[PDB]
């Protein structure tokens, strides 16, 4: 911890010589008072990623209310959500890219977006995402510009309540091409862990991670 | 063709002149995929027999708000799926809604 004594993300932690995935303490804006323990993915395409969503076995409940999605929940070594307030503070300290890793029955795919940011609470955590590359298909472009929606705070573009109807929480529009906080193992139309351009709306994905690191890292 | 009928259609007046209608996705889709839904409605016992068609934006938002309806008038509506090749599926059962005075 010498180049960056208070690394502000997993990329600076990796530059300090931490090259094994696991739990690390980062410091938002390099501030020792703003410590945050995160899971770092240090192997995917060179590493240095903060993981902020993991689905892998359906043990954790992702049908949670606005306060839970603002604050985060779950064991960061297992299934978890980092929290929207954290995501805003991280994506505001610089320019970050998004990576999504997907696995299902021995097949894998990924998507990278060159630009990814989440607004603060007063924007209702508005999503900005653009610049797709990868193999999973560009499903997040549909969600660009949307505020976050939970079953108890409907901000989506639909007449109905997307989060209530499709048993999750997301930057819903009307309603989704991505539903990675949906109901685990649920192959009913649009209800599961969906990435539309990879497996459609009637196939729930076994494993999914969303992660971020500085652009051009 | 296209699909079986939308299920469990329900409708409640929202305000004095609007109606909120919801339904469930057809259980069976035959070949082509569902692209959107049509909400078909007309006055039940009124003189204006204009047949109205509201088309939804996409296939996931299983609800619609109908505006510009007349108080003290009954309406009949049906929901139907429309597939990517333009074909209409089976129509839902008719639902009669009475707007209050
Ligand atoms: Ca809504």
Residue numbers in the entry:
A (entry chain A): 1975 to 2191
B (entry chain B): 310 to 410
Which sentences from the paper describe this structure?
Crystallization trials were thus undertaken with the FN domain of RPTPζ and the Fg domain of TNC mixed in a 1:1 molar ratio. The crystal structure of the RPTPζ–TNC complex was determined and refined to 1.89 Å (Rwork/Rfree = 0.164/0.205). The complex formed by RPTPζ and TNC is almost indistinguishable from the one formed by RPTPζ and TNR. The single RPTPζ-TNC found in the asymmetric unit superimposes onto each of the four complexes found in the RPTPζ-TNR crystal unit cell with RMSD values of 0.717 to 1.107 Å (313–316 Cα positions). It occludes a total of 935 Å2 with a shape complementarity value of 0.75. In the major contact site, R334 and Y368 in RPTPζ interlock with H2163, H2175, and R2151 in TNC, while Q369 forms five hydrogen bonds with S2164, H2150, C2149, and Y2140. Furthermore, the Oδ2 atom of D366 forms a hydrogen bond with the amide group of the N2148 side chain. In the minor site located close to the Ca2+ ion bound to TNC, V2133 is nestled against L329 and I374 in RPTPζ, while the carboxylate group of D370 makes hydrogen bonds with the main chain nitrogen atoms of A2132 and V2133. However, M342 in RPTPζ does not contact residues in TNC. Furthermore, the hydrogen bond between D366 and TNC residue N2148 (N1302 in TNR) is found in only two of the four RPTPζ–TNR complexes, while the bond between the side chain atoms of D370 in RPTPζ and T2134 in TNC (T1288 in TNR) is present in two of the four RPTPζ–TNR complexes. This contact with T2134, a residue that coordinates the Ca2+ ion, might account for the more significant effect that removal of Ca2+ has on interactions between TNC and RPTPζ.
